[PDB]
Design an enzyme around this catalytic site. Structure first.
Site, PDB file in Angstrom:
ATOM      1  N   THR D   1       0.850  -1.226   0.000  1.00  0.00           N
ATOM      2  CA  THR D   1       0.000   0.000   0.000  1.00  0.00           C
ATOM      3  C   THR D   1       0.867   1.250   0.000  1.00  0.00           C
ATOM      4  O   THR D   1       1.803   1.367   0.792  1.00  0.00           O
ATOM      5  CB  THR D   1      -0.937   0.047   1.225  1.00  0.00           C
ATOM      6  OG1 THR D   1      -1.815  -1.087   1.202  1.00  0.00           O
ATOM      7  CG2 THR D   1      -1.769   1.339   1.236  1.00  0.00           C
ATOM      8  N   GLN D   2       0.548   2.179  -0.898  1.00  0.00           N
ATOM      9  CA  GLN D   2       1.238   3.461  -0.968  1.00  0.00           C
ATOM     10  C   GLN D   2       0.231   4.571  -1.248  1.00  0.00           C
ATOM     11  O   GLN D   2      -0.983   4.380  -1.141  1.00  0.00           O
ATOM     12  CB  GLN D   2       2.324   3.477  -2.065  1.00  0.00           C
ATOM     13  CG  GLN D   2       2.782   2.131  -2.599  1.00  0.00           C
ATOM     14  CD  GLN D   2       1.878   1.631  -3.705  1.00  0.00           C
ATOM     15  OE1 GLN D   2       0.657   1.618  -3.555  1.00  0.00           O
ATOM     16  NE2 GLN D   2       2.470   1.235  -4.830  1.00  0.00           N
ATOM     17  N   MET D 107      -1.480  -6.561  -2.243  1.00  0.00           N
ATOM     18  CA  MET D 107      -1.693  -5.295  -1.535  1.00  0.00           C
ATOM     19  C   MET D 107      -0.546  -4.307  -1.764  1.00  0.00           C
ATOM     20  O   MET D 107      -0.149  -3.574  -0.858  1.00  0.00           O
ATOM     21  CB  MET D 107      -1.915  -5.551  -0.037  1.00  0.00           C
ATOM     22  CG  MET D 107      -3.153  -6.381   0.260  1.00  0.00           C
ATOM     23  SD  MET D 107      -4.665  -5.531  -0.232  1.00  0.00           S
ATOM     24  CE  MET D 107      -4.775  -4.273   1.039  1.00  0.00           C
TER      25      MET D 107
END
Ligand SMILES: [Cl-]
Ligand SMILES: [Mg+2]
Ligand SMILES: [Mg+2]
Ligand SMILES: [Mg+2]
Ligand SMILES: [Mg+2]
Lengths: 235, 222, 250, 233, 244, 240, 231, 211
Positions: D1-2, D107
């Site tokens: 996730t970013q 993810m």
């Protein structure tokens, strides 16, 4: 010394060819396929009279529709049977159906060549896998430690195999009944066995669509032996 | 924070006949209040006389269908080109879904075809693999608009025979494919009126012993 | 690739001999003579700097090595094997002791750790034994001064005085006559130089002899002042000049 | 996730009778800062495909390298790399679509929205979308971000359904795309006047136009607008 | 490949023996004799150091007798380096047991654990076995005073009196002759030294060629004391028994 | 890891390492098992080459696997400990997962499977051990006696012997043991077990161990004096 | 001799004997023939039985809708390699929506077989394969040897007595290559080719095995009464 | 959901409703909450349908390999425990299960409650689900051991009906099962709508409802 997975100059795997020699020393097992069912029979060959012969388990259930007879180093068959039972039951889990006899046999034969330097040597046992499915009907397979399996109408493995196979060559026809096949296995077993055939040193079994795989009682087999003796004395 | 899921809308409907089965679904693809496509096929011929639709999150739907088609291919390889029965496919799909029990395919799946006796068959799934056989089942956005109507017009629920006054039910008479397609069309036309995610077009796949046939019908584009 | 030699290369023969250990001991026999002598107030270890070429700078090759501030080591046999053992011995003194107890290990336990490393090369897969015998001299608070020998087998023995390598049999006989329990460190150095002269052929001076002692604390070699309890290393390597001075009174 | 940092806005496209058109502005925004003005967001693959990318530019540059490596790898042990076994738009898309869905399933997505425009071997138009979630869809007109809300309505007036594609010429289609880009310049706060346009035709091949500008803009009426209600001066 | 150089340490002979175990036992038969004798009121451990030197520092030396914990000790016969590897493992095992159950480890449990390690090297791994034979002398509150032995095969047995190393045939005969069940520690001390004195390959048995130890309830009241004899104390007991 | 294939086929179809493991069993001390009508007796030889032995602490030849099952053996002593430990762990694992103690047949099948596994696994040699496993199934009064060997094969026996000179005592059992009427009592069963060992043992002193196992977890080991009384009575009847 | 104990050992003349012994297993195997035109590609295989009660061992395996092979030698090794091809064909379809080129399929088999010839512990594959397929560049026929060598051909044959069929195809080259849009005539040429390798035995209904792939023809196998037409 | 099961002289009765809900929307009304594990074994579904169905089918598999390996049908205690241990690995991970494993073995009729929280309880009477609380009242008041099979089937049917009426998330139809030592016997699917009016008239109950 030399590799376990080594080819001979003739193009054969040494270890596979040597395991076949171990199978020739094993007790006789015979299978006959008919349109009414497949019959499996074995020589128990107890090494002593004190050995309780009913504990000798050379015929084995894989599923309700698949049976199995063995010959050779029988201890090696236990993990093969276990894999077969797991494969049969796992396919029922994934597909809500019985597994094809050929597919089961193929799954067992995939283990065969998984040896090297996986297990350390090939299996020293041959299997007669008999069963029934809706697609190809009553079937009999011969599973070797080479990973090769042939379908058979009738087949004998073990010490008296080539003598029994020649006898099966003459006796088998496509219109055999189940009762005829039962007597035929008993006849050929009695021929190749060292000791005198009775209900305690020989075992019968069959697989039918209706009742599934069944190992015969010693009382039931004893009657088939007595029926055999009378019909041979009839001419 | 990254949300790995989405909602591409869409609605599907599976009805099982006496010797046939239909699987219908609108052709509209959406995110929020925007239309992505007015014609994006959602129901697929997967082989072996089986049709399939995984409604909800399109990315997970496309993946599941892709995997099941692949499962059919390998079933032929592994089991001597044996035909995959509808009941066997259903059980297989359960195991595909439960393989991600802790990161599920966000889709409500329906398959249709014929059972081994030749009778019509529909199976419904939840996102984690609970499945069950059904006769009439809608899935997706407007499922709640459609199913009460089918309960009434297919199964004849709450309908009694005139003169008896609630003593004798209306008899469960079998429907033809033409009668079923009428109910399908009227279901989607009514859903299109009251649900914003339903419209543009309607694609129906009919399954018989002869094979898989398609029918397409326009829906309102607003 | 992968190390596929996961089996022992040292095995028992029918007579009960471990061949590779015996052969390693033979390699030690061919090696240059080294010795150790224990005094009342110190220990001395000595050996010959056998220079392979006169163009080679023999100062760069150290046969006598510091393991801890109070423990030193010398060898006979294969030089490269000794070098790596010293690297491991220095490290194990930290990892298996100093980083745990906050102090340097006593001589006997460091010797025990080195012995363990050598034993494992005698049983583990795909390795040969080390081709060296070590003489480890050291001091610690509760055991005092001590001198140990470590063989290729991993066996170690404490000595009052001993020698290993080329002329060990003759040197050990020489030491038996000269050693007593009242020797001062300077007397032990004198005896060490006498004993070592017998096994040396060519030049015998401070540039061809390597000699170190475990003795009094050297606060001048500590490198810092301000902590009373830290009094400096007991290990000291004698200089070329310091050796030559004692060769005039020989 | 970013989270996306340097970003590219709308990519718009449509089908016409003999091929496809795709366009995208040359801006790389850093939040509200219009940081980079010389960013090319249309990336050709061979002479039959153009991949238009919006979203995170660092992930775009990563994808750009994957496609460059894909061409290299396809040529390996392939005598027909410039003929029968050349890369197709459908191959390039399915590869990207596989990567995007795999990345979201770990993810750790590629924060982009991609449109693959091209012409197949048999002359068929190819136009399909894919994004950071692995979601895919196809349509006669496709647009990302703001383009979905403003460009699609305009482009759908030209090609409202499949049967309008053969009736649409390249001149009409390009005119519609260019008009859409002007509308986005009026109304998208993260857009630029400068843009690139690519045409992939089954007859004339790949035409790649750089350094285009939005022109024929209407601003004169602004002089008459005074205050926010009651003010006259 | 590597197969060419493999000795195959873990295989049977045609007679059903383990080659390496038998050759390890042959190695041990050249090691210094170690004797254990169990009495009603204690245990004796006696052992002969191998051809020593006058320059060997005896008082700080240990090659035969090792302490496993406060209640249990061992006499070694074979490769000392191999024995120390096992000894440290046994020390750790005894402490693990103490930490787990808050009770001192029963002698047999410790012995079984070490013997199982030895067994492992004969059945798998392809490594040479440990060329060591132990005599375990110990005490616990279940069986009291106990003597065990283990060898490279990993087989262990209990004893009233036993010898390992060199000349065990001769030594075991001498012990079998003079040993009695009602024997005491002081008598057992005498028997052990007399047996070594007759079986030794050396010209004479002296204090500098011996290691000696006792495990006695001769500790103040119900408790056990280990005594590793010092060089001077071995010299005194040699005079007391009338050997020097 | 050490992967070498030690157990392999030879040109004549033999696995020599497995057959050489049987030779280790032939060297081992004699062990015998006899099942009566309501009991099973396990007899074991103790070689009298080893005196000065502490019989209190020396590992006993018969080992309890659970409260209702016992295991005796012939062959390498160290190897037997590994099989017994595995068997004991499995017996508790079975009770823990299935809420029933193992049957004698199940436990035998497990031990035999372990032995087999070591005949076709890389880097390991077979167990030089043959076992006699005896006991009574939970809530059952039928005696059970099984035998295993290095190859991995197992089978049920009315009476059986393994180890050195087992050929001789098997000969004795074959003519003396009647299947139609087995030892009706514990006395008769023990007497026959002692008689059989007296054909081979040498002296009937501390060389014979006897362990009687009865239904419902009733296991007891006879003492020297109790056994000595059997030895006395047997030879007094023999003097005629 | 001294250099045939394992695959990792060159002989003094630069030969790999374990690979050569694996090659020998193919020569012991039953004959199979492969040939193609510009539109179709055909496999013809002589199946072998154990005895009269036994079935005839299958020789042809399907890999995809557009590709498959016939085997000669160790059947289990063919099952492993055909499974690998099935996976690679399948990877190409799922990831790239692209049917795997027959030439690339050959390159993949070559590389898989090679790894078994250079590493210790393993063994070479003991089987030869004839791969046919129809891709974007038309019909194809490949010959696989477990040495790693893969060769694209108009026609060929492997197995026992395969030299007879190979000579026939070498004469017929100009004729059968031109058999376009006629599957039955191409099979006839294949059945006539494999007949040059027969001795004593002849082509019966459960003996013969045929497979075909082409322009508008998925890979299909013909056995039993389906090949009675060509006998 | 409403499921129940109880032991009695002539075996064990198993009953359940058929409703499935998605918030307030009724997704299905034909759900099989009695899971046919094997001919001599039953299970119930409550909580997660996917969870209950999957793990109990995976159990059936375990139970069958057992029957092969051991030549003996698994006990209800062993079956329940394999299930409990299997789901215990995934404790705190999200599984929702509330099942009753019903069967007949050497110990007579057997009944074990098993859930995802880790419980495994032997008992003569169980009911799990959102409507369990309504069913228990009818069970506890009429449950005996000397219960005729005819009466026991009615009790299990009436107990579900009580729950289906009051509980919004329970309803549809009633599935009945009877487990004997000769195996289980299916005793039909009963629509609650029709069953309600029938019971009300014949029994006199539900007086407050107008019909
Ligand atoms: Cl072949
Ligand atoms: Mg609208
Ligand atoms: Mg733009
Ligand atoms: Mg479990
Ligand atoms: Mg309700």
């Amino acid at each position: 010394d030399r590799g376990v997975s080594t080819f001979s100059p003739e193009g054969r795997l040494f270890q596979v060819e040597y395991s076949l020699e171990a199978i020739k020393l094993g007790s006789t097992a015979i299978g006959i396929a008919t349109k009414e069912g497949v019959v499996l029979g074995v020589e128990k060959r107890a090494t002593s009279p004190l050995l309780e012969s009913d504990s000798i388990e050379k015929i084995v259930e894989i599923d309700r529709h698949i049976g199995c007879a063995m010959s050779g180093l029988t201890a090696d068959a236990r993990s093969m049977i276990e894999h077969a039972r797991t494969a049969a039951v796992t396919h029922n889990l994934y597909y809500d159906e019985d597994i094809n006899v050929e597919s089961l046999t193929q799954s067992v034969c995939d283990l065969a060549l998984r040896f090297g330097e996986l297990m350390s040597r090939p299996f020293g046992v041959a299997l007669l896998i008999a069963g029934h499915d809706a697609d190809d009907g009553y079937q009999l397979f011969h599973a070797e430690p080479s990973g090769t399996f042939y379908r058979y109408n009738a087949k004998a493995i073990g010490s008296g195999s080539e003598g029994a196979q020649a006898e099966l060559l003459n006796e088998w026809h496509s219109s055999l009944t189940l009762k005829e096949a039962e007597l035929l296995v008993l006849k050929i077993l009695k021929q190749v066995m060292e000791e005198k055939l009775d209900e305690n040193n020989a075992q019968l079994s069959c697989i039918t669509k209706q009742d599934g795989f069944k190992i015969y009682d010693n009382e039931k087999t004893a009657e088939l032996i007595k029926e055999l003796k009378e019909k041979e004395a009839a001419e | 924070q990254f949300n790995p899921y989405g909602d591409n809308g869409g609605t599907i409907l599976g009805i099982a006949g006496e010797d046939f089965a239909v699987l219908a679904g609108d052709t509209r693809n959406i995110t929020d209040y925007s239309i992505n496509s007015r014609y994006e096929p959602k129901v697929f011929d997967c082989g072996d006389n089986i049709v399939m639709s995984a409604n909800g999150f399109a990315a997970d739907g496309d993946a599941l269908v892709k995997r099941f088609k692949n499962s059919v291919k390998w079933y032929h390889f592994d089991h001597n080109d044996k035909k995959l029965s509808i009941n066997s496919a259903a059980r297989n799909i359960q195991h595909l879904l439960y393989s991600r029990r802790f990161f599920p395919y966000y889709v409500y799946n329906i398959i249709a075809g014929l059972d081994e006796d030749g009778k019509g068959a529909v199976y419904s799934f939840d996102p984690v693999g609970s499945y069950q056989r059904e006769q009439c089942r809608a899935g997706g956005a407007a499922a709640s608009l459609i199913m009460p109507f089918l309960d009434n017009q297919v199964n004849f629920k709450n309908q009694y025979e005139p003169g008896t006054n609630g003593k004798v039910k209306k008899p469960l008479k079998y429907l033809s494919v033409e009668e079923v397609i009428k109910l399908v069309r009227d279901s989607f036309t009514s859903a299109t009126e009251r649900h914003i995610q339903v419209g543009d077009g309607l694609e129906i796949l009919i399954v018989t012993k002869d094979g898989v046939r398609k029918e397409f019908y326009e829906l309102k584009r607003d | 690739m992968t190390d596929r030699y996961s089996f022992s290369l040292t095995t028992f023969s029918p007579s009960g001999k471990l061949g590779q250990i015996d052969y390693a001991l033979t390699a030690v026999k061919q090696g240059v003579t080294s010795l150790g002598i224990k005094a009342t107030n110190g220990v001395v270890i000595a050996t010959e700097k056998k220079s392979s070429s006169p163009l080679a700078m023999s100062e760069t090759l150290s046969k006598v090595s510091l393991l801890t501030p109070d423990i030193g080591a010398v060898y006979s046999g294969m030089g490269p094997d000794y070098r790596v053992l010293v690297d491991k011995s220095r490290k194990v003194a930290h990892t298996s002791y100093k980083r745990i107890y906050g102090e340097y290990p006593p001589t006997k336990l460091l010797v025990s750790e080195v012995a363990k490393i050598m034993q494992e090369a005698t049983q583990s897969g795909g390795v040969r034994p080390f081709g060296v015998s070590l003489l480890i001299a050291g001091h610690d608070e509760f055991n005092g001064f001590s001198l140990y020998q470590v063989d290729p087998s991993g066996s170690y023995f404490p000595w009052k005085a001993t020698a290993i390598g080329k002329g060990s049999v003759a040197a050990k006989t020489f030491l038996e006559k000269r050693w007593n329990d009242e020797l001062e460190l300077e007397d032990a150095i004198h005896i060490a130089l006498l004993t070592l002269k017998e096994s040396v052929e060519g030049e015998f001076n401070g540039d061809t002899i390597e000699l170190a002692i475990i003795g009094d604390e050297n606060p001048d070699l500590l490198g810092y002042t301000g902590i009373p309890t830290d009094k400096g290393p007991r290990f000291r390597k004698l200089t070329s000049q310091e050796i030559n001075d004692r060769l005039e009174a020989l | 996730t970013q989270q996306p940092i340097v970003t590219g806005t709308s990519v718009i496209s449509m089908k016409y009778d003999n091929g496809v058109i795709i366009a995208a502005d040359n801006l790389g925004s850093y939040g509200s800062l219009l940081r980079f003005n010389g960013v090319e967001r249309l990336i050709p693959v061979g002479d039959n495909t153009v991949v238009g990318i919006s979203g995170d530019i660092s992930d775009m540059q990563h994808i750009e390298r994957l496609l460059k490596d894909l061409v290299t790898e396809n040529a390996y042990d392939n005598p027909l790399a410039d003929a029968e076994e050349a890369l197709e738009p459908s191959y390039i898309f399915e590869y990207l679509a596989t990567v995007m869905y795999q990345r979201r399933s770990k993810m750790n997505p590629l924060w982009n929205a991609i449109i693959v425009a091209g012409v197949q071997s048999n002359g068929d138009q190819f136009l399909r979308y894919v994004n950071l979630l692995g979601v895919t869809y196809s349509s006669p007109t496709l647009a990302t971000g703001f383009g979905a809300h403003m460009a699609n309505p305009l482009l759908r007036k030209v090609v409202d359904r499949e049967s309008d594609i053969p009736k649409t010429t390249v001149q009409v289609a390009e005119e519609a795309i260019v008009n859409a880009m002007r509308v986005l310049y009026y109304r998208d706060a993260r857009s630029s006047r400068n843009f690139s346009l690519a045409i992939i035709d089954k007859n004339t091949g790949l035409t790649f136009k750089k350094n285009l500008q939005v022109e024929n803009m209407k601003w004169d009426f602004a002089k008459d607008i005074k205050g926010y209600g009651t003010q006259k001066i | 490949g590597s197969r060419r150089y493999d000795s195959r340490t873990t295989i049977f002979s045609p007679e059903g023996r383990l080659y390496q175990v038998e050759y390890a036992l042959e190695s041990i038969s050249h090691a210094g004799t170690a004797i254990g004798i169990m009495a009603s009121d204690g245990i004796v451990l006696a052992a002969e150091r191998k051809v020593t030197s006058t320059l060997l520092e005896q008082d700080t030396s240990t090659e035969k007798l090792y302490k496993l914990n406060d209640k249990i000790a061992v006499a070694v016969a074979g490769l000392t380096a191999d024995a120390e590897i096992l000894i440290n493992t046994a020390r750790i095992h005894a402490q693990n047991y103490l930490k787990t159950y808050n009770e001192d480890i029963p002698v047999e449990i410790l012995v079984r654990r070490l013997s199982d390690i030895k067994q492992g090297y004969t059945q798998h791994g392809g490594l040479r076995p440990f060329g060591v034979s132990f005599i375990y002398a110990g005490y616990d509150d279940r069986y009291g005073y106990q003597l065990y032995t283990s060898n490279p095969s990993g087989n262990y047995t209990g004893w009233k009196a036993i010898s390992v190393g060199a000349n065990t045939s001769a030594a075991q005969t001498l012990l079998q002759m003079d040993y009695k069940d009602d024997m005491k520690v002081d008598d057992a001390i005498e028997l052990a030294l007399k047996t070594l004195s007759k079986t030794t390959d050396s010209s004479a048995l002296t204090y500098d060629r011996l290691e000696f130890a006792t495990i006695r309830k001769g500790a103040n009241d119900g408790e056990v004391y280990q005594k590793i004899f010092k060089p001077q104390e071995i010299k005194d007991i040699l005079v007391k028994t009338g050997i020097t | 890891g050490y992967d070498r294939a030690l157990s392999i086929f030879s040109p004549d179809g033999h696995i020599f390492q497995v057959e050489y493991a049987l030779e280790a069993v032939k060297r081992g001390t004699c062990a015998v098992g006899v099942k009566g009508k309501n009991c099973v007796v396990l007899g074991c030889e103790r070689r009298s080459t080893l005196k000065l032995q502490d019989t209190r602490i020396t590992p006993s030849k018969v080992s309890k696997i659970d409260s209702h099952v016992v295991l005796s053996f012939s062959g390498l002593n160290a190897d037997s400990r590994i099989l017994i430990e595995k068997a004991r762990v499995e017996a508790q694992s079975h009770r823990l997962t299935l809420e029933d103690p193992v049957t004698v047949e199940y436990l035998t099948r497990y031990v035999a499977g372990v032995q087999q596994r070591y005949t076709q696994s890389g880097g390991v040699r077979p167990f030089g051990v043959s076992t006699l496993i005896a006991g009574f199934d939970p809530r059952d009064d039928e005696p059970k006696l099984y035998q295993t060997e290095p190859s991995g094969i197992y089978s049920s026996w009315s009476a059986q012997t393994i180890g050195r000179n087992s050929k001789t005592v098997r000969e004795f059992l074959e003519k003396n043991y009647d299947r139609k009427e087995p030892p009706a009592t514990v006395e008769e069963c023990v007497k026959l077990t002692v008689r059989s060992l007296l054909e081979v043992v040498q002296t009937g002193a501390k060389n014979i161990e006897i362990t009687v196992v009865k239904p419902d977890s009733d296991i007891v080991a006879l003492s020297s004096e109790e056994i000595n009384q059997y030895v006395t009575q047997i030879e007094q009847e023999k003097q005629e | 001799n001294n250099y045939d104990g394992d695959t990792v050992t060159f002989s003094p003349t630069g030969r790999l004997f374990q690979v050569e012994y694996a090659l020998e297993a193919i020569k012991q195997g039953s004959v199979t023939v492969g040939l193609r035109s510009n539109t179709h590609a055909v496999l013809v295989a002589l199946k072998r039985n154990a005895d009269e009660l036994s079935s005839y061992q299958k020789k042809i395996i399907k890999c995809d809708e557009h590709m498959g092979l016939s085997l000669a030698g160790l059947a289990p090794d063919a099952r492993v390699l055909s499974n690998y091809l099935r996976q690679q064909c399948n990877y190409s379809s799922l990831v790239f929506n692209r049917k795997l080129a027959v030439e690339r399929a050959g390159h993949l088999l070559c590389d898989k077989a090679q790894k078994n010839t250079q590493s210790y512990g393993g063994r070479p594959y003991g089987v030869g394969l004839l791969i046919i397929g129809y891709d974007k560049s038309g019909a194809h026929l490949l010959e696989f040897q477990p040495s790693g060598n893969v060769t694209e051909l108009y026609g060929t044959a492997i197995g026992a007595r395969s030299q007879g069929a190979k000579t026939y195809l070498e004469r017929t080259l100009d004729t059968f290559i031109k058999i376009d849009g006629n599957p039955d005539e191409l099979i006839k040429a294949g059945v006539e080719a494999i007949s040059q390798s027969l001795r004593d035995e002849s082509l019966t209904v459960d003996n013969l095995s045929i497979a075909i792939v082409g322009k508008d023809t998925p890979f299909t196998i013909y056995d039993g009464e389906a090949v009675a037409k060509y006998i | 959901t409403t499921t129940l099961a109880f032991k009695f002289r002539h075996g064990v009765i198993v009953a359940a409703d058929s409703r499935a809900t998605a918030g307030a929307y009724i997704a299905s009304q034909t759900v099989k909450k009695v899971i046919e594990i094997n001919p001599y074994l039953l299970g119930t579904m409550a909580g997660g349908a996917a969870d209950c169905s999957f793990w109990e089918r995976l159990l059936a598999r375990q139970c069958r390999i057992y029957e092969l390996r051991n030549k003996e049908r698994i006990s209800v205690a062993a079956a329940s425990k394999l299930l409990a241990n299997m789901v215990y690995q995934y404790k705190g991970m999200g599984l929702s299960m509330g099942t009753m494993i019903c069967g007949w073995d050497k110990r007579g009729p057997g009944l074990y409650y098993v859930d995802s929280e880790g419980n495994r309880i032997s008992g003569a009477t169980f009911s799990v689900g959102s409507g369990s609380v309504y069913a228990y009242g009818v069970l506890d008041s009429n449950y005996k051991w000397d219960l005729s099979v005819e009466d026991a089937l009615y009790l299990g049917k009436r107990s579900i009906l009580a729950a289906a009426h009051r509980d919004a998330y329970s309803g549809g139809s009633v599935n009945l099962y009877h487990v004997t030592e000769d195996g289980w016997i299916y005793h039909g699917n009963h629509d609650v709508g029709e069953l309600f009016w029938k019971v009300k008239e014949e029994e006199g109950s539900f007086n407050n409802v107008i019909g």
